[PDB]
Write a protein that binds this DNA or RNA. Sequence first.
DNA 1: ACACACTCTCCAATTCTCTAA
DNA 2: TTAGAGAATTGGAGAGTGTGTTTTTTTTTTTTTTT
Lengths: 250, 628, 265, 387
Amino acid sequence: VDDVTGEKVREAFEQFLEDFSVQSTDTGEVEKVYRAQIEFMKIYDLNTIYIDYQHLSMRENGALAMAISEQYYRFLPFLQKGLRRVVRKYAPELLNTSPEQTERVFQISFFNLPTVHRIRDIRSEKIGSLLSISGTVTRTSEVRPELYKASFTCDMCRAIVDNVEQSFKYTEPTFCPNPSCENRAFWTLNVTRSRFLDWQKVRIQENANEIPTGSMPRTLDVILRGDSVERAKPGDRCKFTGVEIVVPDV
Amino acid sequence: SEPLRIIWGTNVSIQECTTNFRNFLMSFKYKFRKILDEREEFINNTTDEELYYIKQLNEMRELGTSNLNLDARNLLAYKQTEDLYHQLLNYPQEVISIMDQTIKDCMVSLIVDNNLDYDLDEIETKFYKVRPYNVGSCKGMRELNPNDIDKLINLKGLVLRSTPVIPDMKVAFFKCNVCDHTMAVEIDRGVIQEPARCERIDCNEPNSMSLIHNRCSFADKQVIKLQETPDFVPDGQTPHSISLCVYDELVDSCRAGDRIEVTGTFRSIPIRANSRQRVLKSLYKTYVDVVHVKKVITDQDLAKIREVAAREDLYSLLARSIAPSIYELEDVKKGILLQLFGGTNKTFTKGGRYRGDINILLCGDPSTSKSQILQYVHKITPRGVYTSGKGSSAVGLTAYITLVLESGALVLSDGGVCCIDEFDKMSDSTRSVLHEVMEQQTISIAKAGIITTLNARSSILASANPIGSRYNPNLPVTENIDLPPPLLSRFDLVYLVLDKVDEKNDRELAKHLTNLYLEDKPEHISQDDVLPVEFLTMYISYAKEHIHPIITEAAKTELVRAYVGMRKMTATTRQLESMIRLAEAHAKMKLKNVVELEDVQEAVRLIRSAIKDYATDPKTGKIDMNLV
Amino acid sequence: LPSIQLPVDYNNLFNEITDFLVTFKQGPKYMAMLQKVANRELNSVIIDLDDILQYQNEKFLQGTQADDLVSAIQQNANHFTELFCRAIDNNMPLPTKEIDYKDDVLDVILNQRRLRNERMLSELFPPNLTRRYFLYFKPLSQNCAAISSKPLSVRQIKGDFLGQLITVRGIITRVSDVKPAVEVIAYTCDQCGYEVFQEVNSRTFTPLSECTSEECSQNQTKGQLFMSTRASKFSAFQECKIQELSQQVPVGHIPRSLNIHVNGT
Amino acid sequence: GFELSKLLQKEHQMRKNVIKHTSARHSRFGGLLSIQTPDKTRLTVSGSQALVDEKIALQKLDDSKKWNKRIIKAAEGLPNSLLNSQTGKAIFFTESNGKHFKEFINNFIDSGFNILLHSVTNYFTTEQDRMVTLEQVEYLLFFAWFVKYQLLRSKIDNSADIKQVSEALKEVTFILVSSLLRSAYDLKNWTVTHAGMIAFNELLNLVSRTKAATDIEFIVSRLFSDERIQLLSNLPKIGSKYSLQFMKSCIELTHSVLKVLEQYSNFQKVQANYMTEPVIETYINFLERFRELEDDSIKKVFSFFHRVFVQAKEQALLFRFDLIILLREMLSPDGLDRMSRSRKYVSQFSDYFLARLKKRLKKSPAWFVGLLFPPLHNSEVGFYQRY
DNA sequence: ACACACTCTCCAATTCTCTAA
DNA sequence: TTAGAGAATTGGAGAGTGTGTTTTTTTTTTTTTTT
Ligand SMILES: Nc1ncnc2c1ncn2[C@@H]1O[C@H](COP(=O)(O)OP(=O)(O)NP(=O)(O)O)[C@@H](O)[C@H]1O
Ligand SMILES: [Mg+2]
Ligand SMILES: [Zn+2]
Ligand SMILES: [Zn+2]
Ligand SMILES: [Zn+2]
């Protein structure tokens, strides 16, 4: 089964990346800033791209921006698939990170959203949407490696399983792929073939000047990944953006 | 004839309830409630004939809002719903749902019948809820019994604390692992009804679906801790508390220290012995499931307020009415009134913010009725606290580390009046806390694991007796009061009250106090003309909200002249600011937008009158008792 | 596995109980109370042992032998709460006044269940589910007197007394607030539309999860059971603690205490 | 972006459908409901919406029951193609790639199609006995694709012409496609039977095009000798067991076949050959999976039902209960969209259906028990039963 | 020993196929 | 064209086996001995 909305969003975001076509800061000449940003990333071997929400708002009567805003969690993989094709088209050197080279894990980023919420305004109706939040940092954790994609090999026979997906808990295969063997136990994680990500926990509290009458400040936990770890500092004031999620009891 | 729907174990038919509530909703008019009221003479024929709830529904449509209040007594007025009232109390869960679906259908019927422009899809999308209240007599917290389970209840109490919002699941989302088929599933009775096999026809496989957490749908839940009010506690015991569960709209309504009345079903549930197995314990937990919360405007109100403000004797009328039964002490009452009104809050783009609140100290001989006045101030104010000197610690007065921070008295009293009695008994260590809060109206904390600043817009009303426990005329006034200068400097008004013997005064006082015992529950009152407490509260609240005076050039000249006169001779910089703040408070009480020469002179006069300056020897600082 | 003889036969004592409830007078005393119970006016019955002693003496003076029921219910007090309840249920008179019977959910449920059985045919439920009253014993007057009349301090309550009816003197230390406790639990089967009950005595229990009804089974209807509060039976519960007087503590010792349970009115 | 926005409107409609079955108050607030039948027997259901909606209560009551009857299942040995995959799923092109591919196959058709098909078809007539399944399925799905594409292109624009694909009609290729379908059907090789079905469908469509403009009528008369009518009438009956694509191929072929013989003016003999129970069984079995199907196939199905019910006046076939369930499912707010063109046809059919059913049931009350079961084939009572 | 998770085994319910009237 | 006799495939009833469980601050109110 296939989701038509995802593919249409994918290949519309493709067109946005191709031909946003804003004119120059100084002259009436089409500049195509995001293709230039891809070229910049190619020059410096970067792995993240920044997008302005105002630019997305004016595109195609705002429907694409609405779809990205209200259902970010559904549509994030399709945006990645859309960006991969464009970077292949114009800068195939960026797709790889001598022996073979693994693929680059691109990151899309947004900024200049319409409004900033407080920690006190987080409510369960907004789960999975795109938001921005501000507060004071109070604690930070050390950087840890998070397992992103896994690969295992069977003990009782020479067989390999690859590209297992994790989500919130450490997860392992269900069968031995070789039908000559039935052992489910004694898997081992191949650290070389598997892939990891950088991961950091930080903790924030409300701004002091905003606290209502007779109340006390609430707190929140925030996750940082990729090239943004160790950017925050305790005691500083910061502004965040992302999506709020829900974490189980593992 | 046909199958029927019956509430389980009742033989109550849902059709009758639906039709009766529809008729009530679409034909009730307020006149019937006045028939049940004491007199038909109250009836306003023009207004009371109107269809009340149709008006409410039109307002709900055009304001884009979802919830309807309903005081249950109207069900008794309309003849067709007399029995529905009892059924509501006995079977809340089914009846309230019936009422909800009735209201939504009526809202649709209005637009389609009256053929209006409003989007039908929008109304179909929304949820509509009824919220009954004023159900009946309130019930003591300790007197709820097991025969009250699942019936509607009404409680009064005070709010201790509230937990943060908890996400509560309502809809589950499944996805097929192999073929990527998806299904949404309804949650009822707390159990997820997972499918046995993937429902796609060609992918009919077992164990093939799986849950996706962050694509589910959730709802807000919160738990509030309610404490028994002292009026009901048994003799020689301490108050108890009960827990309230609240959802969706009413989540973040209430803060610590609030005083409320609620309405909700009284529920009970089991609890497990261990998390591994289905073994339950014999004792059941109990809690309350609230559906409405209440705190314990019209042109006629504005007309009454404006008409009262035009009276010549307004200033004396308001002052003598805050504490009717207390004899004389007029200046003390006037100062307390000006504390109640308060100044104006000023904030700059740079250079800070300046307090509007007034601090008062009452000092003098015993038996002079200071604490009785503190009782009146404690009960008049919307928010506030009463406490004693020996009952207060430094932590309890401000804030408490428990890792979480917790509020003290001055924080709970934010925006109100904090009454402190036996002020002279608390130690210098405890009293040193009040410097920062009085000056800045903020509380700074720096302890292990917590460092922050909190706001405290709190007014202090203090009571004390002099050193030696009776005023000694052979010592100067500052030595009798005995508070250190850094703390005494922070009060706007300081009162001396003295137990001076005089036959003229004594006969009037004795006749006043003895008259209260001529009746079992006295009707007698000190003065012919006083305002009721409700209307006085309305006046003060409106004047606080709407009026914001500003200084005038004539007022500038008088303030400079008066401050220089008192200073040139001890008066300090704080005397000027307190004078401005008192003049602002005086201006609000007359509903003026400008502070004027009269207000400044009144503020000066009251400051001079409070500390008995006219009777004070200007050089030695002692008071001639003969001049009192 | 083994067995013994004992001097007591409960049939004779049951006969004595049912005679005592219908005969004794200071009409008979307790039939008035049971009439008030039937009228829904009264919630509890308090049995005096002074009445039983007087009854025994009067029966003896009439020239007939009788078992000493007083000592019998002091020695093994727990069993006789059930015997008296069964006797009361057997002998309960009919109401004197209209009641508005439809206010009771259990009446409607049991009437419908009986009608279902009647149609099907073209113990049912535990008797505890319909006992609208409580029952207590009151000890012997000491001035007529037996151990139940003589107070004991908390130290004198040895392990010999387990099972007996006694009296204790002391100071209360703490009291809990009231909460409900289950006695009979009610369920509903979704597919076959049939109700079943469960009785709870121990501190914990396992709820039912399968409809084992014979009709439901023979239709092979593996339906699901769900709990219901609206037809369950609760009873009020409270727990306290009592402690010996300080002026009775022997030298060098620490005071002792006992746990008290309270149910009903 | 425009079509994406329209699709988001459709998503909102589905969201609205979920909302209309969603309770206002939370999941543990719910009370309990009891429903009493005739004969005073009572049932129990939970949930707040059951209190008000009897339809939802009746559906929810049956939904709890555990059992489902286990189910029966046709092709293997060939990579993925139209024969064994749902082809409502495109593959996606760049603008340059789209125009380049269009240019390639357009030049192919205008240049190469006739010469290639003549050579390869006059090969296989001399080599049919030696064939393997690959070459049969290859030939039959090359034929179909290019004929269909030329028909659509000339439907669109006048610059194209139908003469570019005209080699398909000449007699040898017609004989060969016929022979492949024949031999595949006899040996019960169902994959080649499917592919031959698709090819023979396109030949009939092309004939109906050319008659709308000499030898083509001769080719028709030879295409509809009685033997071929026996085969083409036999085909939908066996389709009941097979995958969804097989039944759809049968339906579209049947539509084309009957329409061509409609425009021949024999007809009454041929139509009576088609109308009987097992064909109607296939049609209903196909129709109940409407959630996966196109807008057009349902139009074809209800065209056939109009033919059976109104024109031929063989009303007795459709008085069978599993059709009456389907019209409830398809016509409810559950299924077909309130504004799709399907609802016009469906409601206009159901009105007449229930009118005639009312008449029949009041004239003869025995049909109440009749509606559950198949019709009864006894000589003496069956004739009055059917009419 | 008392609820659970998981494995193993046998038996009969069901559909498919062939034969003759 | 119906139907009935024989063979093959599948479901889950239910019986069996193994398993797990009890159980150095830092902040704040109060009594006590020590300078
Ligand atoms: N002017 C007065 N009007 C009314 N009651 C008065 C007045 N003067 C004294 N009383 C009575 O005298 C008592 C004074 O009690 P109280 O309120 O404690 O005075 P106080 O100022 O608090 N003295 P103290 O607590 O020793 O510092 C009360 O019973 C009053 O009713
Ligand atoms: Mg006092
Ligand atoms: Zn293996
Ligand atoms: Zn699937
Ligand atoms: Zn059952």
